[PDB]
Design a protein around this ligand. Structure first.
Ligand SMILES: [Co+2]
Ligand SMILES: [Co+2]
Lengths: 472, 472
């Protein structure tokens, strides 16, 4: 017999993800505002620490598929849930866009987000480079909001508990009000969850607020949440049960109920949770055309490849002809990842590494490198967790003609707000607000079409009751 | 800071449920033998402690829907998995049938099961009355096989840790080689799992073998499995990941992977598991017409009513007309359950209590009692966990004309083997074996039709590839 030290009896906070990450992960971010507003009053009174409802891929989805202004959605959520802490996911210097922006664009985006109601900003970087998060977080502090620095969890030869403890320290040094451990691929197992949370708390103090964000893709993370709570985690992210599991998240009600008698508890109102659950249970069937077909996939623990990346490369192998080389492409991913400095395999790094892996198997090793892969190797996306392969770096410079850099990429970007503002002002439909200039700066190719059709009002791409009933 | 005592580092055994409980729970027990045999070689070499592949509702499904002889399925499994411990679920004195049988029928069934290859017999009773399990377990010991006495876990005012420890002792006293904690409704939370397993081990010794069987219906039991392992559980039941979650069970691969670095481990071969997973992933879509629509339901923690029982009563309220009394029927279930002595709400007790609850709301309190409810109240199903309501008992006697009993029901049953054998021998198709007489004794109304069509060979009720592709 042995013993395990566990935290003192206490309340654990819960962050609800149904309005953002749950539908992004389970139904391609297609959830229409019309299908969510009806649950806002109950969500607002359920007792959550925060409600994630903006950022991530929802900005793109609003203007590209739902003809909806993302800023109007944020204003509506602020109005319908006046007593809640609203939370968003922001990818640092890239904001919600496709590239790094000059510091002034980051300042304006954060300022308008805060002005329109955002309370908690979860700032992250796909390569875990703190320098890419530094300016956005300073802007959040300037706005007087809560800055949550994020650490993307991954498994690799260079990622260790000591490495995560070091990263947490760098985030606290740049003003983070809290630290978020983000496990998008559900790779965080129970013992590592306990060990990392405990090491951060022991090193920086019990006052260090840590929020754990785990998906349920591999089926092991609800046990990780329990171990994280024993290690002292302050808040855990979950999704209402009718919109949970699979590539999504662990169920809110299940996480609350499992704590009975352990000394830990949540302050969630079960009656409100039941109403929220029933609300989405009635709406989810309309999104069947966008659902995934796998509830549990643990293959990543061996292959390091997330199912979303795997099927993606598979489509590239068929449309290319030789798909009988899938087993070869999978053995190549680890090699490419290593060459790139072992970055976490989350969007967009995953698509980039996967594509380069397919190219190496097709036209030979680094014979043809995508422009994005070349940029990673040359440092235009920031620093990697480990040193990149000098041999491959050299090849990237000889194919791109760009010189390798090691300093924060945005240091080289010139002011661009005036240029963005002038170009945006020439599009039919532009309403003159900084919000619209931001939409143009973030999605130049979609902004034109959106501005022209926005007046029609938001639409839904979900099946109608008639179509649903017509299918049965 | 506090501490929790956990068991010493050790290997935890795993029982695979894909061949029996997984499809019984997820696709109405309709899995065709043709769709399972292809995975037997891999299952046999995966390293499981046992493979559940018989008993439960599969006997009924074979002869009622698949025109398959259950004894041929058992023989086939024995031949294709020669190195594995085969396991079945047997409902004590009721065997796999609809009523209590005379001791001689129980003796013959167990003898033929053992003769045809069964290794582990999980014997249980829906009301947790050990007397109804006693004879079947003696028959298992006579056959030299492994007798696993079962405790059905439930939550009620009269169920306590001390009560379960007492039951475990009674099972060990009647020769149990191991104790199974069966949680069909997924009501077992983490702390209770730890407390009960620890109390049994502390009271009867670390040598006491305990197997935990939890469904994943409420979404909290994988954490319960982890706590049960910390408390010292010897074996846990799981289902291959492509046939898991929902009303089913926690994923085999997820349970094995979550233990990395905790000091606990399993001896499962991940490559074999991957092959089994892929096998069923390709077959499951063909059974879509029999799938359920809810992955997680925690309402039972408040209502004591399992979703399978809830929807069932709902159908009775509509086909009856007044379904606007559903909220009244749900408040009645607890009252009826209490009157019956708080039996666990598992089949068949659940359907019985649910029906009587609907009757009380319709024609008044116990105005009209079903014959089955009357039998429970009068003791013809055995003793209840708590004392039954004398007032309701009296009413049952005045409506059935039967006198209340308190001794084991089978004590009153006369020899019946010769009578069963003669009647069975008059049916066209009867092959003269004791196995066929057992089929007739267990399912008198289906045996005639089955014996006449068995020669056509087993069929499948799943969609064909053509029908599947035709639907897409
Ligand atoms: Co996420
Ligand atoms: Co079961």
């Amino acid at each position: 017999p042995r013993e395990i030290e566990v935290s003192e009896p206490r309340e654990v906070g819960i962050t609800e993800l149904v309005l953002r990450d749950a539908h992004q992960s389970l139904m391609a971010t297609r959830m229409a505002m019309e299908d969510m507003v009806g649950a806002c009053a109950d969500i607002d009174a359920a007792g959550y620490w925060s409600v994630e409802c903006w950022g991530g891929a929802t900005y793109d989805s609003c203007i590209r598929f739902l003809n909806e202004d993302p800023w109007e959605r944020l204003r509506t959520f602020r109005k319908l849930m006046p007593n809640s802490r609203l939370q968003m996911l922001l990818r640092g210097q890239n904001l919600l866009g496709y590239r790094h922006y000059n510091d002034e664009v980051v300042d304006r985006f954060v300022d308008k987000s805060a002005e329109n109601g955002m309370d908690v900003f979860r700032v992250f970087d796909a390569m875990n480079d703190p320098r890419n998060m530094a300016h956005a977080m300073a802007a959040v502090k300037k706005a007087g909001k809560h800055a949550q620095g994020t650490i993307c969890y991954t498994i690799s030869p260079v990622h260790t508990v000591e490495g995560y403890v070091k990263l947490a320290g760098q985030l606290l040094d740049m003003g983070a009000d809290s630290i978020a451990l983000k496990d998008m691929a559900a790779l965080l197992k129970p013992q590592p969850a306990y060990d990392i949370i405990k090491a951060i708390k022991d090193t920086y103090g019990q006052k260090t607020q840590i929020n754990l964000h785990c998906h349920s893709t591999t089926g092991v993370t609800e046990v990780s949440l329990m171990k994280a709570i024993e290690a002292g985690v302050d808040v855990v992210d979950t999704a209402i049960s009718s919109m949970s599991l699979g590539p999504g998240h662990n169920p809110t009600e299940s996480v609350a109920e499992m704590l009975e008698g352990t000394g830990y508890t949540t302050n969630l109102d079960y009656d409100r949770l039941h109403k929220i659950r029933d609300h989405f249970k009635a709406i989810r069937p309309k999104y069947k055309k966008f659902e995934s077909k796998t509830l549990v996939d643990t293959s990543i623990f061996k292959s390091q490849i997330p199912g979303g990346m795997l099927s993606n490369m598979e489509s590239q192998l068929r449309a290319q002809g030789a798909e009988d080389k899938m087993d070869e492409v999978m053995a190549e991913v680890p090699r490419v990842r290593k060459a790139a400095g072992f970055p976490p395999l989350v969007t967009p790094s995953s698509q980039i590494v996967g594509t380069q892996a397919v190219f190496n198997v097709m036209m030979g090793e680094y014979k043809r490198m995508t422009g994005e892969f070349a940029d990673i190797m040359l440092g235009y996306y920031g620093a990697s967790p480990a040193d990149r392969d000098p041999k491959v770096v050299k090849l990237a410079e000889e194919q791109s003609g760009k010189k390798p850099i090691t300093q924060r990429p945005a240091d080289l970007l010139p002011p661009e707000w005036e240029k963005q503002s002038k170009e945006a002002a020439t599009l039919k439909g532009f309403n003159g607000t900084d919000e619209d200039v931001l939409t143009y700066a973030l999605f130049p190719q979609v902004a034109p079409v959106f501005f022209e059709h926005r007046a029609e009002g938001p639409h839904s791409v979900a099946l109608t009751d008639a179509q649903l009933k017509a299918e049965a």
